[PDB]
Ligand binder design. Structure first.
Ligand SMILES: CN(C)c1cc(-c2ccncc2)c(-c2ccccc2)nn1
Ligand SMILES: Fc1ccc(-c2n[nH]cc2-c2ccncc2)cc1
Ligand SMILES: [Zn+2]
Length: 339
């Protein structure tokens, strides 16, 4: 066991091992507080996230276990991975706080899209890295469900990695329409829709669907992609949604070459395959990587898939003490990756 030292940053106390020095607050939120630090053992700049109230509720305890299980499993250049995980507690009885450590990423895609207008070559590299990480995530039968610019970390090298009422976001401009319709059988291609919205934002500099609420969000989406056709209509079970979409004003599918003027016709062709209403016909991450848009980056031998990921815990109804004990087991059993 290492030696821990204590200090108070902002209004939160931090008890981290001695190997992490020069702790500096970089961000905060519902998830928890993140501090930049220097790791003296490896010489790397790392990010240390202290989870907030990790076991205040069953929702918190299970989400703490889920995040730790996910981060321990992701080993991919374009997905955030665990360099270390620790707790200052010496036993299960005192187990109260959880700290996670990864490589320090300086900014996100929002701090880049607003500060500059990305060239087409930068859009290719950034979207390729997202899809390369999405193929890995999706190969483990994992759906991100919340892909957005603020969840995409980027450093100076333009290297990219994918990252109750608390943390409520009113409208998600990047959410697939099938989720906005509260469809329960949405698939992995909900993430591909978000990539299309992100890629459109990088090409134009504007939010593609900046809706004000869930109803306004659907109206903005339907104005571009058109109202559902007959094949899609046959798949809507909720009469409330089927009658709503039929009662609405019939909008035709717009010409994407007219919407995204001056853009690379290869990029427009990809956007047409990503921003498809019917999720059955949406391009997948693996298919998108082979698109001619990424001809200079695509390498079929260098786009790996993930090891099988056991999600059986997601259907379990355990107690807070059980999720807590399961999380403690994952903390101790953690082995770091080779330097
Ligand atoms: C919600 N959000 C923006 C983030 C950012 C980061 C982050 C990652 C890398 N560098 C800087 C910040 C983290 C994080 C996750 C695990 C360990 C440490 C930090 N979690 N959430
Ligand atoms: F307006 C829309 C927006 C999205 C969809 C949709 N695309 N893929 C699946 C669905 C869907 C939505 C609701 N219920 C079943 C299926 C259908 C109509
Ligand atoms: Zn909560």
């Amino acid at each position: 066991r290492p030696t821990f030292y204590r200090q108070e940053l902002n209004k939160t106390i931090w008890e981290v091992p001695e190997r992490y020095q020069n702790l500096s607050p970089v961000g905060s939120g519902a998830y928890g507080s993140v501090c930049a630090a220097f790791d003296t053992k490896t010489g790397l700049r790392v990010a240390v996230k202290k989870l907030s109230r990790p076991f205040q509720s069953i929702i918190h305890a299970k989400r703490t276990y889920r995040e730790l299980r996910l981060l321990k499993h992701m080993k991919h250049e374009n997905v955030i991975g665990l360099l270390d995980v620790f707790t200052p507690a010496r036993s299960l009885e005192e187990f109260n706080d959880v700290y996670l450590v990864t490589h320090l990423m300086g900014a996100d895609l929002n701090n880049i899209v607003k500060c500059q207008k990305l060239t087409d070559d930068h859009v290719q590299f950034l979207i390729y890295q997202i899809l390369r990480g999405l193929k890995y995530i999706h190969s483990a039968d994992i759906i991100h469900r919340d892909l957005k610019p603020s969840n995409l970390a980027v450093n100076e090298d333009c290297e990219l990695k994918i990252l109750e009422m608390t943390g409520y976001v009113a409208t998600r401009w990047y959410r697939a329409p099938e989720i906005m319709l509260n469809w329960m059988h949405y698939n992995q291609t909900v993430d591909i829709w978000s990539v299309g919205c992100i890629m459109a934002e990088l090409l134009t500099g504007r939010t593609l669907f900046p809706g004000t609420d869930h109803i306004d969000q659907l109206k903005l989406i339907l104005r571009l992609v058109g109202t559902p056709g007959a094949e899609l209509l046959k798949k809507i079970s909720s009469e409330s949604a089927r009658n709503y979409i039929q009662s609405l004003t019939q909008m035709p599918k717009m010409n994407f070459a007219n919407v995204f003027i001056g853009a690379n016709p290869l990029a427009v062709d990809l956007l047409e395959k990503m921003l498809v209403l019917d999720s059955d016909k949406r391009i997948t991450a693996a298919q998108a990587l082979a698109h001619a848009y990424f001809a200079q980056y695509h390498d079929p031998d260098d786009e790996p898939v993930a090891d099988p990921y056991d999600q059986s815990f997601e259907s379990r109804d355990l107690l807070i003490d059980e999720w807590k004990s399961l999380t403690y087991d994952e903390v101790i059993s953690f082995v770091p990756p080779p330097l």
